[PDB]
Structure formats: structure tokens, C-alpha cells
């Protein structure tokens, strides 16, 4: 039979779970076996970019590149989203995917292993966690946010009871989509459109409002060629205050 | 002995799964109470103040103030570390108990229950993870620290490859304490001994070096009112370049 994206998605989960995470905060997952090629890296290429490759749709990954296969569709993918915190033990990474048909983002998945929880985006229709469809918190009286950035928006932590930098931004993303945060900021102009794509598809359909620094709403994409910065936000006007409380 | 307050660890870990953790991922849990203290943290206060209260020991909460049972022993506790980030479905939450022999540290716990790891730290024998030694690792790449500040931070982040800021400052310090991070900088001027006196006896005994503002050996008091700073390292160079980078 023909499977859906969302039956691939369980098919990498299964995957990941068998594969992967016996790795987790393992000496072993640094090492290298083949730029120093990990092991962990190796294992989430033949499990997970080389599932994407054998669909032959074109396939947009940090670790290997971007593979033209002059399909009709173009998927990117994190394989672990949160390297260094897998790496390191430190429970929050995730497998973060994105499907376009052409230009236009048809599904996204963000698969949270430690606490079993499948994400997904589906433009048109909603985001779900777990089968259940979610959508942004109402804006707490006390916003509490993710916040990245290398030294600008100062101004911003007045604003907020609390913020977070967790270590894998697609996730918080789902976070925010989920209603455990209010915002997710990045201004450290480190960031590309591939890094967002997955996260701002599953956010958006829950409600969140995505701009840049000049308050144009986020382009989902799978260029690498820019760097972008974003206020991902479940209020306008709390999403208006960040961005008047950054410089330049 | 230490042996003892071990088993009094593991009768926690089990009350603790039992009475809390069914509590992760349910609504219930985030109720607020009193006036802001959620039905959680107070679930968490009984089942572990109540245990140390009926031992006859001298016990320090923050909630609670510090209990004088005129006892040799007094155990400062935070019965939950990562209070908002439970309730909201982020794996970053901790029990964090230090004992101290009269003013005496000779024990330290802290228990993250996400993925089932206790940290113990024995002052003159060692810091250990689930019973294997830890230590804090060698400074040999441009660090990732654990950060919090009110104010402006360019500097340090100038500093550091990476930052986190997870909510629970006792895993931070646990982390710093088996080489997960290089540092922990928390200069808000908004933790209690509470917070981070387990985290700052597991570490020391790692290897880390934790000091104050003034650049002093953090000493951990028997109150639950008084505010601290604490600049944590695994290199003595690292911390003093982090304490010279400090703005407003």
C-alpha cells in the first residue's frame, strides 16, 4: 500500500527509538567514525536521511548537504535536533522534519523521544501532539519565553517572568505550538530559514504569529542561503513589545 | 552515616514517582493553591518535609523557612526544582537535598527523575551518577554554560560557544558536576541556598569551583530568605574571565 507522511513518520520514530536513542548521552555517539564524523551521525544518515533519499524526493540536511534529485518535492530534516544536548545527556532533542511540494509546505513532524511525544503541522488543517490537536495558550499574565540571542534585546527580559534557552529550537517551537510557552525569540542572526522550517509549520497552524525583526510575517522555506532572526508569538501585542525592545 | 541517608534518598525517588510524576502531563498539577504555589509544589512539600520533620532533623525549605527541631543534622531542601517547567511538560525538573552535620556538609542528592538519575555527592569520597564517579571535564573547547541575568549579558556570551538556561538550577550544577556543561552563571540575585546547596556540594566534590560575586568560596547558609550569586567553573581561568565580562 501507498503510506502517508504521517505513516513515514512513524516508521522514523520507530526507528529512532531502536537505533538512536540507545545512544543517548553515550561516550560512544561522540566517537568518531569517519570534519570528524560521528557515530551517531553516521547511524541517523542510514536510518533517516537515507529513508528521505530512497522516497527520491530532494533532501535539504546540515550534515549532508542538499541532495537534487529533480523530485517534485523537497524534505528537510533534522535527524537530531539538539546535538549537543543528546550528546551531552541533557533531554531535549528531537527529529524535525519538513515536506514542501514545490515551494509550499505540505507537513511537518517533530518527534520528542524522551517524552514520547509526536508533533505534527499540517497547513489548512491544524497541529497535533500525539494525535490530539493543539493551539497556542492564551497569553499569560506572566509571559515566559525561549530566548537566543548574542547580546541585543536587553529590554526584553522586563518584559517576561521567565525565559528558557533549551538547546534545540525546533522544539521549543513545538513547545510554543503546544501552549508551554508564550514566545520563542531568536536574534542572533545564527539561525536559517531550513533551522525554522519544521517548527514554524507546526507553530503557525497552532496559532502563533512568526515574524522577523521587521515585523514581516516568516516565509517557510528551504533556503540556506540567509540568516534570519524571528519573534514566534501567541499575542500580537506581546509580539510588537519584543520586537520595539530590540536594537538595531 | 551516609549509608543511611542513602536509603532515606531512595524512599524519596519512590515517593516521589508515586506521588508526583503521575502528576507530569495532568492538568491538576498546576492548579494554584495558595498566593504563587501550585498543587505540586505542595504535594512535593508534604511527602518530603514531612519525611525529614519525622526523622527529628532541622529542616530548611524555602516555603516552609527553616524548621529548629534542636537536632545535630539539618537537611536543606528544594522539594521540586523546575516548578514552571513540570507544569508545562518540560523535562527539566529535580529534589535536590543537602545534609549537613551541623555546619558540616556530608551528603547531597539530586534526583532527576526524566530520565532516572540520581547525582550523589560524599564530601572526602566523591560525586557519582547512579553509583558511577563523576567529574567535571577538562576545558578544552570554547565553553557552553548554564546562564541567567536580569540585565545585559554580551559580554559573557561573547565568552561561550553556547548557553542554557533550563529552569533547574540544581541540574545545571548537576550537569556541571559530570562534565555536561563547563559552567553555571546565575547572577539575578534571585536563588536561595534552597536552591542550590545539593547542586554546589556535588559539584565541589566533582571538581567544580563555585563562587560569588566577590569572587569568595559560595558558603551555603541555613536560610531560605537570603539571595545568592553563584558563578560555577571547571577552570579557575574560565570563571575569572566570566566574573571580569559581568555588566549591569
Known amino acids: 500500500s501507498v503510506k502517508t507522511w504521517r505513516k513515514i513518520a512513524i516508521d ?44 527520491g524526493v530532494n533532501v ?30 541533557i533531554p531535549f532533542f528531537a527529529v524535525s522534519v519538513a515536506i514542501f511540494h514545490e515551494k509550499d509546505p505540505i507537513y ?3 518527534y520528542e523521544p524522551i517524552v514520547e511525544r509526536l508533533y505534527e503541522g499540517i497547513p489548512g488543517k ?17 509571559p515566559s519565553i525561549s530566548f537566543y540571542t548574542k547580546g541585543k534585546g536587553t529590554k526584553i527580559i522586563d518584559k517576561v517572568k521567565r525565559t528558557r534557552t533549551l538547546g534545540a529550537i525546533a522544539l521549543e ?16 542572526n545564527y539561525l536559517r530559514p531550513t533551522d525554522i522550517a519544521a517548527g514554524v509549520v507546526i507553530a503557525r497552524e497552532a496559532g502563533a504569529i512568526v515574524k522577523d525583526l521587521d515585523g514581516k510575517d516568516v516565509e517557510i522555506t528551504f533556503s540556506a ?3 534570519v532572526n524571528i519573534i514566534a508569538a501567541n499575542n500580537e501585542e506581546l509580539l510588537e513589545t519584543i520586537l520595539r525592545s530590540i536594537e538595531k
Do not use: C
Open 12 to 55: 522514523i520514530i520507530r526507528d529512532f527509538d531502536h537505533n538512536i536513542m540507545p545512544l543517548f548521552g553515550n561516550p560512544k555517539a561522540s566517537e568518531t567514525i569517519s570534519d570528524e564524523t560521528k557515530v551517531v551521525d553516521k547511524v541517523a544518515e542510514n536510518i533517516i536521511i537515507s529513508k528521505f533519499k530512497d522516497l
Open 60 to 89: 535539504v540536511s546540515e550534515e549532508i548537504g542538499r541532495i537534487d534529485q529533480g523530485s517534485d518535492y523537497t524534505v528537510v530534516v533534522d535527524p537530531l535536533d539538539g546535538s549537543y544536548n543528546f550528546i551531552n545527556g
Open 108 to 110: 511537518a513532524f517533530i
Open 126 to 142: 491544524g497541529s497535533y501532539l500525539n494525535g490530539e490537536k493543539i493551539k497556542v495558550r492564551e497569553l499569560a499574565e506572566k
Open 173 to 188: 517551537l513545538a513547545y510554543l505550538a503546544r501552549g508551554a510557552l508564550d514566545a520563542v525569540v531568536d536574534i542572533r
Open 225 to 227: 542561503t540567509e540568516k
